[PDB]
Amino acid sequence: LVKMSHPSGDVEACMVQVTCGSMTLNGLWLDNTVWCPRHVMCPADQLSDPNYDALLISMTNHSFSVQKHIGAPANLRVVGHAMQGTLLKLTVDVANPSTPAYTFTTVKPGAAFSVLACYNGRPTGTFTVVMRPNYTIKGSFLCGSAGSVGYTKEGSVINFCYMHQMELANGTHTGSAFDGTMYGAFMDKQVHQVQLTDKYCSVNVVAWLYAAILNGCAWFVKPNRTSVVSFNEWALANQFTEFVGTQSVDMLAVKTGVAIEQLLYAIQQLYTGFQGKQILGSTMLEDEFTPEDVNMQIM
Amino acid sequence: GLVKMSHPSGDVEACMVQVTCGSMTLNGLWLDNTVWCPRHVMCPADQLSDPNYDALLISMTNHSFSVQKHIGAPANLRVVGHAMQGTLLKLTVDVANPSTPAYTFTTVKPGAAFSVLACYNGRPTGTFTVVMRPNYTIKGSFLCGSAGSVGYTKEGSVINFCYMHQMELANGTHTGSAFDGTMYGAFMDKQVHQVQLTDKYCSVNVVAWLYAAILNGCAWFVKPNRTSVVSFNEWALANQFTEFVGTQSVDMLAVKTGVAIEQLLYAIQQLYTGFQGKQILGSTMLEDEFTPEDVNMQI
Ligand SMILES: CC(C)(C)c1ccc(N(C(=O)c2c[nH]cn2)[C@@H](C(=O)NC2CCCCC2)c2cccnc2)cc1
Ligand SMILES: CC(C)(C)c1ccc(N(C(=O)c2c[nH]cn2)[C@@H](C(=O)NC2CCCCC2)c2cccnc2)cc1
DSSP states (O other), rough: OOOBBBBOOHHHHEEEEEEEETEEEEEEEEETEEEEEEOOOOOOTOOOOOHHHHHHHHHHHOOOOEEEOSSEEEEOOOOEEEEEEEEEEESSOOTTTTTTOEEOOOTTTTEEEEEEEEETTTEEEEEEEEETTOOOBBBOOOOOOTEEEEEEEETTEEEEEEEEEEEETSSOOOETTTTTOOOOGOOOSSSSSOOOOOOOOHHHOOOHHHHHHTTOOOOTSSSOOOOOHEEEEEEHTTTTTOOOOOOOHHHHHHHHHHOOHHHHHHHHHHHHHOTTOBTTBBSSSOOOOOOOOOOOHHH | OOOOOOOOOHHHHHHHEEEEEEEEEEEEEEEEEEEEEEEGGGGGTTTSSSSSSSHHHHHHTTTTTTEOOOOOOOOEEEEEEEEETTTTEEEEEEEETTTTEEEEOOOOOOOOEEEEEEEEETEEEEEEEEOOOTSHHHHHHHOTTTOOEEEEEEEETTTEEEEEEEEOOOOOOOOEEESSSOOOGGGSSSSOOOOOOOOOOOOHHHHHHHHOOOOTTTTTOOOOOOOOHHHHHHHHTTTTTTTOOOHHHHHHHHHOOOOOHHHHHHHHHHHHOOOTTOOOOTBSSSSSOOOOOHHHOOO
């Protein structure tokens, strides 16, 4: 059970550097469009209250410089600009010759995706995250990583689901979907904002306990059961998400012979403390492995 | 708040090929005019118990090997010579990889981290990072057909290829070769049950993790007491720890925190007998999978 990411080559070929005035960050070049956070337009003196409608008017095509450093370089010419929620949509006069087949879909809490971290348009690392129940993610993002993208891949099709926007007050990160909406509705300004409480992703904890059983670690399995409806009542009071079963979870239950409701009961007990014991090299519950992850990696 | 980070894999993806010999197929690494792959692709499927690789090489002919590139513009690559180096084959092909990165071949040491590109049938499917264990295995996520998958580090634009995947051991752990051809831990590429040595804690990585704990406000384990490196290292031989070897990366953590290596070596001796009633970054067990370099670049 390792933290697995998709191979990043397809997305690396799309990363560019976008500069506007004194701001520089990353953009995603797909066909004739370069996507980037709209806060590239924010002046250094208006961090706390930018008017993005106003800033958009004051811009022309010549206000944005776009450079591709990786691979086959350029030196793109911006020939149009528009704003879409919290994103800039720049039109450039060359279609990216390495554009993958792609879609734009918003991810839901508990779902995993790969992130390609970039600085000044250069990819530097990749890792996998889950969208937290409070619509934040915990990866490794340093200064200038804005515009780094998160994505999944199915067959030949990349689903772009995240473009990094900002660090929040609790050391945590959020970003936009490519429809322009910010995950969790955070504002792209220097302003005090509160994030809701995080929660354990119940269905991923279930998947992880199934991975433990599959690896011969089942000391926590009892005959006792908690129904889904009763677990979901308990979860509201203990910062767990609502458990929603899936065909992926059912495959693990069939394979191990341990019912979902046995693991729901185990979670309730393990939340109280592991006593002196370990599960898959961990002394706490793990909720960043999805049922699909466990099925892929162990079956 | 450490995360498992891998290098972007695009450069390496462009070098992966599929190598077929008889009815056996696995992955190869295409650099300049050479394709590297595990020599057990020559082993007949009924003869896994103990092959004679010197003889198998002799019996190979002009067209015993088929190499296919699937990524990019697909192509058959004609094999024009074949050599053996340790547990790897070195196949000469008549076309040079037009996307050969600047590269070296260095053997990694236990405790060091590297990125792995997992492939099947010459097609990359995922990337993850591991540390070389003290018993010269790695805890990867590798399924059947992953042989030939490659591990590597990067410095600047130079890729250091350090691992080519060879086999899965009885305990689910994995081993492979360095590109000089030597199998890590001298494991034999035969269908023979063989014994891996007992694992150990990577001492320099536990030190790194204690430094990350101190950087995040968790320092209750720091006392004035010191254990010298030489004293720690003799203790380590009897208590399942690797020898401690300092590096410039560790030194930078010492400077940032004002805590000396020898204070943490003392602390490790105490934490090994027990955390008593406390936790370190929420955990009650020692973490040795993050390197000094990881902590320096992430915190
Ligand atoms: C203009 C605006 C909206 C206030 C803003 C300012 C800076 C950035 N940050 C850029 O690093 C960066 C680089 N280029 C442009 N911005 C960083 C960032 O969020 N600091 C926040 C700290 C206080 C709350 C507001 C901003 C950042 C660091 C590490 C990982 N992720 C992002 C993001 C948004
Ligand atoms: C010929 C030789 C040396 C005995 C051998 C045979 C099979 C493989 N394995 C290939 O999957 C595979 C695919 N193509 C060629 N080999 C698998 C493997 O190690 N089973 C071991 C089982 C008992 C001990 C011998 C090998 C494998 C599975 C998952 C992840 N990693 C490797 C590796 C080496």
